[PDB]
Write a protein that binds this ligand. Sequence first.
Ligand SMILES: [Zn+2]
Ligand SMILES: [Zn+2]
Ligand SMILES: [Zn+2]
Ligand SMILES: [Zn+2]
Lengths: 309, 309
Amino acid sequence: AMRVIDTHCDALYKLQAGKGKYTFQDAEELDVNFERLIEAKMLLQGFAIFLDEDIPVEHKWKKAVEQVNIFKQHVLHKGGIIHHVKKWCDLENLPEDKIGAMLTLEGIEPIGRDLDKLTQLLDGGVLSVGLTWNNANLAADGIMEERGAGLTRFGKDIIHLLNERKVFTDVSHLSVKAFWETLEQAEFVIASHSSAKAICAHPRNLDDEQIKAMIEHDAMIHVIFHPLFTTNDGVADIEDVIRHIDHICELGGMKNIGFGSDFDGIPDHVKGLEHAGKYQNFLETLGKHYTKEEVEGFASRNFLNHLPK
Amino acid sequence: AMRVIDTHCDALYKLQAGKGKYTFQDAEELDVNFERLIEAKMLLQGFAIFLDEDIPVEHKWKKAVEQVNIFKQHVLHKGGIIHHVKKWCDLENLPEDKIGAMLTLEGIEPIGRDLDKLTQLLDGGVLSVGLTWNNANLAADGIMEERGAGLTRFGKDIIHLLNERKVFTDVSHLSVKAFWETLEQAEFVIASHSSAKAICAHPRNLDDEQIKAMIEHDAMIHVIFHPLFTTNDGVADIEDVIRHIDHICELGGMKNIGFGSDFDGIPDHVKGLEHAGKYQNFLETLGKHYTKEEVEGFASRNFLNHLPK
Ligand SMILES: [Zn+2]
Ligand SMILES: [Zn+2]
Ligand SMILES: [Zn+2]
Ligand SMILES: [Zn+2]
């Protein structure tokens, strides 16, 4: 039984937007639903808290908390199997029949200038935080901001707290400058859903020096199943995804690769990776390029070897 | 009788903080109150919209609308004499017995990332906009942010809107980088309350190169009545303020100088200038140093030669 850790899906965002017309148990419009987790044989799934950039700055904090309660009410205890991983020890002591679920924060927009709002979310079980989504915010510039500046003092204050609380600092949407400053400050670095710039040149992807630095830093790179970041022409199959894994391995990152699908946040899908239920198929295909020992590394063992401590 | 244009006071912030306790007509706590505007022979006073940095992000818009309402309800029409300058033509056509009052925005924090909220403020009469106060925000870094970055996409979009609406872009608290990028983007530039760094080396002040650039751009520099920005030692009298005026004149900016007191935002005052009712005393001292025609330039004519058109 090849169990799977996936670091990033947008199920919370989709449920929230759905206004009840979607049930987490079996909605077919959700790449990540309860049935599809079982079928994926998930060990752990990360659920991102993420608000539309058009949610007014003064409603952000309320809508975030709402997504959290959607998690607590809809996702948790589903079928008596979904278990809340609120701390890394909850993960290391999870049963074989239970599936772990954790919360992650995709941009700090919901917290304004307030570190107590962040502390609240951390007390709620948030185990990974990305300072930015695509845009400039109070902590740093995201990757689509042309200015591409690094961290503010507020940003550094945030990371200092993440370090203190054994929470991942997620660089996936971070500007190039922010990424580098973050590596300097953060103790536990992850890229929750990124691929390799050398294979697909989207600004969102990691260049070779950044990948080497991640490896050197002992950080995790979780490759994304989004075709816009997989191939330059934006149309991709499973083999295309594998070419990104190949690239990171050739840079020496065999032990630093995991999966970060970005399921439910995908406008278009990779052929054969249409939803979390297609996971074991993906692993079988992967298994023609990598030993089972290596695939298990990508699937869960690398991540489990990199828990904040 | 020489009339006075002053581009910047914090009466709205004080009024709001006073929680109804301060009457605009004559409160001693208000550096700019009605009786003192009369004594000053004010022609036009700028009223800044400014929130404590500690106001949570989700309440900023509300607190700002509060200040606009304070302006409309406590300031306008007082004595049948205070007249709303909502557009520049209201200023050039002010009836003889009237005193003009205009709104300005001291940092774009209250609008979140919503350009429409800015459009509302502009429609309500904001005629000058500083992108930042001291801190990083969604538009640019302020002068006290270590990162010291320039304009974001949002900041550039704001300036385009200000250009189109014939509104001043105010660089008084902008980071050095943001200052230079703003001179590039903004059609109508002002420093609503800033002095000369060569005289007083505070980081908020303008160095000779910046001043020469302001003059070249045909921008207005309004000298401040804050001791902290007036003398290196923080203790100042009227003659100390005049040194800044002299300095700018020497750089060739006699026609680009006006006044920006920052009254009501000053913990300790320039001796002799403790409130707006001392303004004529100020002009009397200027008159030792400059012809009457030159003093009228600083007091109002210069600003009146620089209205956005
Ligand atoms: Zn997302
Ligand atoms: Zn995303
Ligand atoms: Zn102010
Ligand atoms: Zn100020």
